[PDB]
Amino acid sequence: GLMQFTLPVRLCKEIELFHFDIGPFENMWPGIFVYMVHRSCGTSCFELEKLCRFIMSVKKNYRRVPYHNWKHAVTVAHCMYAILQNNHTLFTDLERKGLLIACLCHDLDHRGFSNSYLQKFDHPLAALYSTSTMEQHHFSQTVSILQLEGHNIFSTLSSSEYEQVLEIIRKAIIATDLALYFGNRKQLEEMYQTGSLNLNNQSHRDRVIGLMMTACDLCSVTKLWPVTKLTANDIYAEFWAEGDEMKKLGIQPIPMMDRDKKDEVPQGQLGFYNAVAIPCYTTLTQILPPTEPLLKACRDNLSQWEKVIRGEE
Numbered sequence: 001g002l003m004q005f006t007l008p009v010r011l012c013k014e015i016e017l018f019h020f021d022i023g024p025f026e027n028m029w030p031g032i033f034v035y036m037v038h039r040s041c042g043t044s045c046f047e048l049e050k051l052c053r054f055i056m057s058v059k060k061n062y063r064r065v066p067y068h069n070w071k072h073a074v075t076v077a078h079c080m081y082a083i084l085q086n087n088h089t090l091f092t093d094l095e096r097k098g099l100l101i102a103c104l105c106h107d108l109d110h111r112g113f114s115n116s117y118l119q120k121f122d123h124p125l126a127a128l129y130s131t132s133t134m135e136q137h138h139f140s141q142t143v144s145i146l147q148l149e150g151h152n153i154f155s156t157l158s159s160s161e162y163e164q165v166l167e168i169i170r171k172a173i174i175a176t177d178l179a180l181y182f183g184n185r186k187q188l189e190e191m192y193q194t195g196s197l198n199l200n201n202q203s204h205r206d207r208v209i210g211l212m213m214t215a216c217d218l219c220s221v222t223k224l225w226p227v228t229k230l231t232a233n234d235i236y237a238e239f240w241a242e243g244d245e246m247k248k249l250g251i252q253p254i255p256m257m258d259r260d261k262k263d264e265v266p267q268g269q270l271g272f273y274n275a276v277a278i279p280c281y282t283t284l285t286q287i288l289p290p291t292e293p294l295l296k297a298c299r300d301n302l303s304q305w306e307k308v309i310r311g312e313e
């Protein structure tokens with residue numbers, strides 16, 4: 001009850017900044033997450049025995065893939081921590097509980113392959129879930145782990161609060177399907193400009209939470225340049241393996257996944273920042289002004305990719 005987690009001084013300070021990197025010491029990541037839950041939610045939000053057992057079961061159900069791994073889960077949860085901390089009063093007690101857990105679980109049991117690859121392969125998950133295939137799988141796995149004896153961190157919620165939190169986590173995880181991001185952001189853009197955006201409207205809150213999930217999920221583009229650049233190696237390591245497997249099915253992959261088109265990475269990064277990253281953090285900054293450091297970090301990184309193209313690095 002009186003047991004806090006404490007980090008070393010450099011981590012205690014930098015963990016509050018949007019651009020924090022959680023470091024290469026895997027054994028510290030669970031404590032970093034518990035620290036963030038305690039400061040974000042309270043030391044009473046969860047029974048520490050059940051939370052610790054939830055964390056270690058979630059860790060076990062992430063695989064050894066280059067990018068969609070346990071480091072990504074904790075990284076995405078840290079970005080959500082920074083958003084919630086910088087927007088103290090805008091979120092309910094249930095939303096703060098649900099969203100950090102949602103981020104930790106958002107890519108559970110990822111195999112390193114896109115929804116398109118599962119469909120073209122004719123993978124069983126593609127028959128079970130026709131759209132947002134992996135994201136429906138990730139939520140399914142989250143419910144499974146919550147139902148293990150000793151793992152139900154929500155047990156002290158009432159029946160209706162339990163149903164509300166699972167529903168927050170479900171929409172939050174579905175919203176990390178990038179196919180759905182584009183329409184979600186256009187709607188939030190119209191609503192903000194015509195002035196109809198209303199944060200007491202549940203359907204509006206849902207949309208805003210969806211954008212927060214895209215922002216946290218893409219947060220490698222908001223780090224210091226050396227982190228952004230080294231994470232891009234892991235992202236393309238997964239993509240190029242998928243392209244290899246497309247060729248095995250007799251299908252030319254899109255250039256993003258074809259290792260033979262490495263040379264076009266810098267130009268592909270520009271398109272991604274201009275079409276997805278910048279618009280995402282711009283709309284998020286309009287709705288939640290204190291998230292501006294993410295937009296500023298994203299624009300810095302766009303500038304670094306432009307310098308790569310101009311041969312300056």
Ligand SMILES: COc1c(C)cnc(CSc2nc3ccc4cccnc4c3[nH]2)c1C
Pocket residue numbers: 218219220221232235255256257261262264265266267268269271272
């Ligand atoms: C997970 O989201 C991402 C993040 C965070 C960073 N980078 C990316 C990759 S963006 C990207 N879009 C394209 C389009 C054509 C390409 C042709 C040749 C090489 N790379 C390409 C590329 N990379 C993604 C998808």
Ligand SMILES: [Mg+2]
Pocket residue numbers: 106107134176177
């Ligand atoms: Mg995902």
Ligand SMILES: [Zn+2]
Pocket residue numbers: 072076106107176217
């Ligand atoms: Zn993810």
